[PDB]
Design a protein around this ligand. Structure first.
Ligand SMILES: C/C(=C\COP(=O)(O)OP(=O)(O)O)CC/C=C(\C)CNc1ccccc1
Ligand SMILES: [Mg+2]
Ligand SMILES: [Mg+2]
Ligand SMILES: [Mg+2]
Length: 536
């Protein structure tokens, strides 16, 4: 039994994360200052009689600075008051920001707030083309559209063309802020990634910056980063004591990138156990994926799939030796979770993630059977199988395991494949197929996603990759709609699903598999979030 040659890049990190010792001296210093700075900032938020535009800029600034999670209450109370007052008497900049902030927090503010900036056509008044700050906020706001916001259909295109035209002559740091927005809007970016950029490249270089907020943000980011580094060290050690690097060499060695993925789902300290649990799962399912996708014979993947279904160590003897390595590690991982959760009595909930992994595995095997047989399913049939293979139903479910507040009713909701969950699953699928179309139209895979879309609709690779990006746009509208109150579960359990969609957009920016090829895209992110501190 001779197998496809290993062709993956090795982890570019070595063991540079393997051992991080926190400096308690530094950490307690940072924390002590932050407490003072926090209250200073709380009082800024609670100041009486501010103008609407000042309030929205304050909240915007704090959120971009990455310190808003300290003021969920305060910030919500303020937006709720703003929402319930209906202020239709502002300019484009304030209006667009008001719109974006309220929408991001689930307040279904009407898009009619924009009617005053449009002609009798729904086309934005061209006279606004010289109002860069207005354009900039209209641009950002244009990305939180739901299906009901067709009024904003022109906003992205209008804002874009005029931001592009103005950028070269703007002063700094506004120029850099615009250029970066044009490349990566705020709403669909990874929060820590955007925050690092905002703090260092923009806010720190503003003539007008608030020094208390700047300092607060720098200290908080560097403090959490110490936590993240501990987390990664612990996970790196865990991955090293697994040694899949040598025993399962056919697979991608990307546990750092997996941690990046878990960090994107949530960064707050309260989600530390959840990150550690999540990243282990991400890492492990990545191995399973590579075993189906680049090593195991169909006969071998059958025994593997059945053994996953039966879920019981008595099945290892039925498996090839290298498959016993991954299989016992999988079963072990879940007994780990059961125990890690044992003290808070939340052990039972593990079977939700287990069942979702079984489901992923089932569809890995189908996918495999299609490739062997050379089957090109109709797009409907292809999606009904290829949605789960994103692993995203599964990761979403996993992400709840470590959240102390996650009740059974939450998992119950997530199991019914709610529309918000399905939308980010769709985004993952259509982006993965677009990026890795020419990756694996070379590796002999006649069963690619795009290849179904072409044979089915009688359309070219052009129209195929479009009609896919099409579904991505629809899905973002559904995500945005899914955040609106009344929410089906508490917002805390929606943000991970939204964050999962964000990470896919960011990793595959410019249409490249940034996970398999972390070099160009992911490595700079990883350096700025987990290697370099923000110099103070
Ligand atoms: C990275 C991987 C699948 C993508 O690689 P590939 O394009 O070869 O998959 P495919 O066979 O088309 O499903 C899943 C393992 C890593 C995880 C959980 C998070 N990252 C992720 C990235 C893209 C798709 C799904 C998930
Ligand atoms: Mg696969
Ligand atoms: Mg794969
Ligand atoms: Mg693919």
């Amino acid at each position: 039994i001779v197998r496809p040659v290993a062709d993956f890049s090795p982890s570019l990190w070595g063991d540079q994360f393997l051992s991080f010792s926190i400096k308690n001296q530094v950490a307690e210093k940072y924390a002590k200052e932050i407490e003072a700075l926090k209250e200073q900032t709380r009082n800024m938020l609670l100041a009486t009689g501010m103008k609407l535009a000042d309030t929205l800029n304050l909240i915007d600034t704090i959120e971009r600075l990455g310190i808003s999670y300290h003021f969920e209450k305060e910030i919500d109370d303020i937006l709720d008051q703003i929402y319930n007052q209906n202020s239709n008497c502002n300019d484009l900049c304030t209006s667009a920001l008001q719109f974006r902030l309220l929408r991001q927090h689930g307040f279904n503010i009407s898009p009619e707030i924009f009617s005053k900036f449009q002609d009798e056509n729904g086309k934005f008044k061209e006279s606004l083309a010289s109002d860069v700050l207005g354009l900039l906020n209209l641009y950002e706001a244009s990305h939180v559209r739901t299906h009901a916001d067709d009024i904003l259909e022109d906003a992205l295109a209008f804002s874009t063309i005029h931001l592009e035209s103005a950028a070269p002559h703007l002063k700094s740091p506004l120029r850099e802020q615009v250029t970066h927005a044009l490349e990566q809007c705020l709403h669909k970016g990874v929060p820590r990634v955007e925050t690092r950029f905002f703090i260092s490249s923009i806010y720190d270089k503003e003539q007008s910056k608030n020094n208390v907020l700047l300092r607060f943000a720098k200290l908080d980011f560097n403090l959490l980063q110490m936590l993240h580094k501990q987390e990664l060290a612990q996970v790196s050690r865990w991955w090293k004591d697994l040694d899949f690097v040598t025993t399962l060499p056919y697979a991608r060695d990307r546990v750092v990138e997996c941690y990046f993925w878990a960090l994107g789902v949530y960064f707050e300290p309260q989600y530390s156990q959840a990150r550690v649990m999540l990243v282990k799962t991400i890492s492990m399912i990545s191995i399973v994926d590579d075993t189906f996708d680049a090593y195991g014979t169909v006969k071998e993947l059958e025994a593997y799939t059945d053994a996953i279904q039966r879920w019981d160590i008595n099945e290892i003897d039925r498996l090839p030796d290298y498959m016993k390595i991954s299989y016992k590690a999988i079963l072990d991982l879940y007994k780990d979770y059961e125990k890690e959760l044992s003290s808070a009595g939340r052990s039972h909930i593990v079977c939700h993630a287990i069942e979702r992994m079984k489901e992923v595995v089932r569809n890995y095997n189908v996918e495999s059977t299609w490739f062997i047989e050379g089957y090109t399913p109709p797009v409907s049939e292809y999606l009904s199988n290829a949605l789960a293979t994103t692993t995203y139903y599964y990761l979403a479910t996993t992400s709840y395991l470590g959240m102390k507040s996650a009740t059974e009713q939450d998992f119950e909701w997530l199991s019914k494949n709610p529309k918000i969950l399905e939308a980010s699953v769709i985004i993952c699928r259509v982006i993965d197929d677009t990026a890795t179309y020419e990756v694996e139209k070379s590796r002999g895979q006649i069963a690619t996603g795009i290849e179904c879309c072409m044979r089915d609709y009688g359309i070219s690779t052009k129209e195929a990759m479009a009609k896919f990006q099409n579904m991505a746009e629809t899905a973002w509208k559904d995500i945005n709609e899914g955040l609106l109150r009344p929410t089906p579960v508490s917002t805390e359990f929606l943000t991970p699903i939204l964050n999962l969609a964000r990470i896919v957009e960011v990793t595959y920016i410019h249409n490249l598999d940034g996970y398999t090829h972390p070099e160009k895209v992911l490595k700079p992110h990883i350096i700025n979030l987990l290697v370099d501190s923000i110099k103070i």
